[PDB]
Symmetry: C3
Subunit: 495 residues, 3 copies
């Protein structure tokens, strides 16, 4: 009899962590940091709903393809949702210059206010109502983009247009016009009389003469003619003037950029649901509680950081061991109010008291190390949506290499952080147990025999009063020194 | 007499590793991970040979400059080899719009099948044979690109061309045509009669009128006229139609894109050799066995990862120490079946038995740590070839900064990994030796005297039977306890 | 009496370092590595002054807007300083094609030599003096760009111009011309007679017909006409020829690129001062001594590496503890010639001698670890200035994401390096103290009692002669063995 042991926590847990050295090492306590689930819905962003384009494309919406709903209310939006291949684009076929730049401008835009600038009924000198085509049905009749006017000769005359708009607003105006490319010479005269036409646009920044390119082309949604659209931003106190002798597709409405800020054009097939998040991905939404996730790289909002991994587990507590009679042999399921502690074994004592002078000091630096690593990735790379046309392959791939490039880097960083500080977390516990022992060993010196398993046996009488002497760094050799010098002489001369 | 020592491996090796702390530290065992050699040849890629353009440029090949060999067999290729400054490009001088994009499309292309679409002999209404020039010799005569036709007025007439090709294939067609820019008004009429011409191309995606730009230019390979080429991809079930009144350089053959996949345009001066690899660089080929290399950044195939370093050496074993009588003093050349072990010294014994209960457990986590680091760079940045024209300097440099940017990062990563896990590999060995000792010390307690060099001297009689008691965690104090309590009393009272 | 203690340095220092584990840990010795100050001036770069554009823009300078000073001396420059929004650009309004590419070419250019190529007085057939406008005042009169000529019909005639320059220099020539876009048909005839004009330019690389685009535009600095400029580099032994029938803005002077090399276009509002640096930022200059700084990302010269941090402190020495009687309790302010050492306490001795066999060996690997980390970031990402026009937003943001992307990475790297090697630096010190103890313990074995605080008490007589026996790894048990075996028997049998 008359013993004392130094040991560590153990418990029912089976959570598993990894290090540089070892795979799958069971631990008392561990915290997962990788979000891997999503809700498959398309939610609003902290109260603010997305602009859902339905089966339409940004060009369809802006130009007002008869198939796409105007947004009469002038709403703000948190992001824009476009299908992967929308069906309602340029219903009348053609091209839309610097389209992918316009889309990129939408990503920093949060609210438009549509405003009339040239009212459709103000083109006295031309036919403002025959410009419709079979390619643009609204309710089965022939129609046309709501937001632009296809001007056509009135009375076999086409008087040269010169018209101007002064932008008297505080905001930037986004303005869109177009020019018509007929398929033969006979049709050019049929529509605009003058055989040779142009479309001129002037602002202080932009000067452009546009000319009708007549070619023989396949049928797209029915026609072989084409229509090419342009666009520009008109700054406040600047004016724009158009002049043409034909082929001019004039704007009726402009778009007040009224709210800039964080936004995005997400490509997704989903539709809206009565729901809200702090983090949206194209395939659903994320419970942004954990610091990392692997659901999708193109997440927007207040999001955890994306890493290409399948799990990522911090270690916070000991390894998990029975495990009897001191630390050399494992940990004590019977310790519960700490991680490292002791075991009494006295004339009166039972055992199992914890040294939270070093257990709090360890839960101290552990949960302080824990989100100091979470915060050291606050600067991590968050990817951003961009699009490129068929003649921009090189930089599309430059952009791809760049975004995958950083994601691989930050993934490497994330993993190496966990593996390394895992190994240092466990290496800490051991040294903590191992110093508990020593704090006892350098108190009880002569008066006890090191038993080689992690316990000491007393060359004196202990009492419970004094077994707090050793826990508290209190025990003093002299007051039990003589009683021990006695008995060790007697084992020396025992049986 | 009556001793036992705890010591470690040492041997003839002189391999040197580095850490954060120290340079050039000799070790028992080490493994190099940096490939630094190449074979200076240009080999096939795992059975599949490269398309070697010889003295020609991608434009020369595609257009079929009379100097460049057609590839009649329609071969597939693993990569494309272009000289740094080929001599057979546009032999007739001009430009080739979105050339560097076309080159980039080749990088994802593995096989072409050339196919006739407008047979040279089907232009009844024009002269299909006078379009040759002194700038394009084949066998010293005047000639011209094999794959396009220089159409010229037949009989002082040039009837307006309108011709169409429906792409009835499953594959994408790559199609190339051109327009002629004469040097004076008199020559334009000399060749095409009509003073004012155009070249119109239509597909469902592309609409383009092209117009002859007459200027006065220097002589390039003899001429002052110019020729500008265009190109487009015609998707299946789409058609293309050309129409012109002159200056039209019509396609004869199109290129079926038949195999897409991994490929590349390597710039190299070398030529092919009877040889094969899994990794090709522009300056030769690589024995892809090791995980890193430093031969060249633009390597293709199944390649080790490029890092800008001169050596990179993993440490796997101990430091390298004579080194006599226990671990405090160095390692034992005489231990051979392990890394850590013991030394007998008995009434019968010699010494030098290894504790492979902790030597296998160390060769365990070492070669497991070894390629866990190799695999943690499986996601590393691999650079990709791209080209940019003289007006694309900014993004050419963006691309350069990006690729050097990641290579510096990954090089830093690679080195810090080795240095750090080197320091933890050696720090492991020491703690392994140092725990061998303790496993012995906590067995033999009273019955032996710690000699301070790493050995114990027995206060009892040992025998070989029992010196496996201490190796095997077997030795039990009581069965030799009385014989020791005897003698230590007698040194206490000896001489 | 008769003692000896093992302890460590401590001193007046209050410098604070951080690790993964703990914040704000005081240390004996530490070195700051983050430059955070600048001088707010704009200095020369190692003797070589910047080209200060004052209120002008690169286009103003090159074209020689009457408001911008020519640089008659043909100076070289280390960098170029442009205000954020200069006031002297195209005073005559228009555009300047591939402007941001030209600016990028300046960044690799260090010296121009302006040279006449078409002397203003050599246009016999046209009016070379009426081309001035109210938009370009010099000293209040009407004027025009010094470096180009606005050619205007002489005598209601405009004979077709064809003029050529052979570049007979070793250097690349930078050449700039322009074309005039009038506001109405009547003005085009007023200035150039011929109603329909063109501007043709030929080199071996460039072929271009330019055509006057007449539109109705707002007034910029007074006018509604516009002027569009072009530019090209003419390589040596190549020639260029222009021809026009009107609207031609002809070059007078060209720019010999005479010195290429490292340079930059810094945007800054500052002006020059009598001052020099090795590192310039847009907001001032940097004492490039430390390895990292956080003043500004766009620093040029021989600069420390930019990291987005507020402090970065290496730990080099111990923690900072009174701290009495051995290492278990703290460090000794009284040790001064080392970091770890001893304390005598003898029949004659006082104490406090240092073991610089392990103190030099620690100042060894510490200052070797110190700039091995500084040198492991020698490859770090240095950002580079680039500009993009309003239709290049996507790649402008690609470039921004890329540069912030690497800066976040390298900042993470920098911090993790310090935190981790800080923790290993302190963890070293402790193990160094802790091995000092042991080197003593395994010498003095039986002959001393471990006192549990870090000191030993001698079972024999020591003398100063022998207390170097223990410092020097010299002390040998036998020569004091008998005197100790005596007294320990007497404590066993003492009071
Ligand atoms: C602008 C114009 O001419 N519109 C006309 C269209 C188009 O010509 C075709 O759809 C080809 O564009 O043809 C109509 O019969 C129709 O579809 O109602 C009459 C209409 O006025
Ligand atoms: C298309 C054409 O006109 N080809 C003719 C060429 C070219 O005119 C010159 O090489 C300048 O292009 O001149 C020839 O004497 C020749 O070289 O055989 C006759 C030939 O028919
Ligand atoms: C090239 C030209 O015509 N220059 C003339 C200018 C410009 O016409 C206007 O500034 C509009 O460009 O007008 C003047 O009265 C002037 O300002 O001295 C005469 C001068 O010769």
């Amino acid at each position: 009899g008359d013993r004392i042991c130094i040991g560590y926590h153990a418990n029912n847990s089976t959570t598993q962590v990894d290090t540089i050295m070892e795979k799958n090492v069971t631990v008392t306590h561990a915290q997962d940091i990788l979000e891997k689930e999503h809700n498959g819905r398309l939610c609003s962003l902290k109260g603010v709903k997305p602009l859902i384009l339905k089966n339409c494309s940004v060009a369809g919406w802006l130009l007002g393809n008869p198939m796409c709903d105007e947004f009469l209310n002038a709403p703000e939006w948190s992001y824009i949702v476009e299908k992967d291949r929308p069906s309602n684009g340029l219903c009348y076929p053609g091209t839309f210059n610097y389209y992918e730049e316009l889309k990129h401008l939408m990503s920093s835009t949060n609210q438009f206010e549509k405003i009339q600038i040239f009212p459709r009924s103000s083109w006295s000198n031309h036919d403002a109502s025959s410009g419709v085509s079979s390619a643009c049905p609204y309710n089965g009749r022939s129609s046309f983009f709501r937001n632009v006017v296809w001007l056509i000769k009135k009375n076999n005359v086409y008087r040269t247009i010169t018209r101007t708009y002064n932008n008297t607003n505080i905001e930037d105006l986004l303005i869109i016009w177009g020019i018509h490319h007929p398929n033969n010479a006979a049709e050019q005269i049929k529509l605009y009389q003058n055989p040779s036409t142009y479309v001129s646009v002037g602002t202080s920044t932009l000067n452009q003469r546009s000319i009708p390119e007549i070619a023989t082309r396949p049928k797209v949604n029915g026609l072989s003619s084409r229509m090419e659209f342009f666009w520009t931003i008109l700054r406040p106190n600047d004016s724009i003037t158009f002049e043409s002798t034909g082929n001019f597709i004039a704007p009726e409405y402009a778009y007040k950029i009224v709210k800039k800020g964080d936004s995005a054009i997400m490509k997704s097939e989903l539709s809206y649901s009565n729901c809200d998040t702090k983090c949206q991905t194209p395939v659903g939404a994320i419970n942004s509680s954990m610091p990392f996730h692997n659901v999708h790289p193109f997440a927007i909002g207040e999001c955890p950081k994306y890493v290409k991994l399948k799990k990522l587990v911090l270690a916070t507590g000991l390894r998990n061991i029975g495990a009897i009679a001191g630390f050399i042999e494992g940990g004590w399921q019977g310790m519960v109010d700490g991680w490292y502690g002791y075991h009494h074994s006295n004339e009166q004592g039972s055992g199992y008291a914890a040294d939270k002078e070093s257990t709090q000091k360890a839960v101290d630096g552990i949960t302080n190390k824990v989100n100091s690593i979470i915060s050291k990735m606050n600067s991590q790379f968050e990817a951003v949506g961009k699009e490129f046309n068929n003649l921009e392959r090189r930089i599309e791939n430059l952009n791809k290499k760049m975004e995958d490039g950083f994601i691989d880097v930050w993934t490497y960083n994330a993993e190496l952080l966990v593996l390394m500080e895992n190994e240092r977390t466990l290496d800490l516990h051991d040294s903590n147990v191992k110093n508990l022992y020593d704090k006892v060993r350098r108190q009880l010196r002569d008066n006890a025999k090191e038993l080689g398993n992690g316990c000491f046996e007393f060359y004196h009488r202990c009492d419970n009063k004094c077994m707090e002497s050793v826990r508290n760094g209190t025990y003093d050799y002299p007051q039990y020194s003589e009683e021990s010098r006695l008995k060790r002489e007697e084992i020396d001369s025992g049986l």
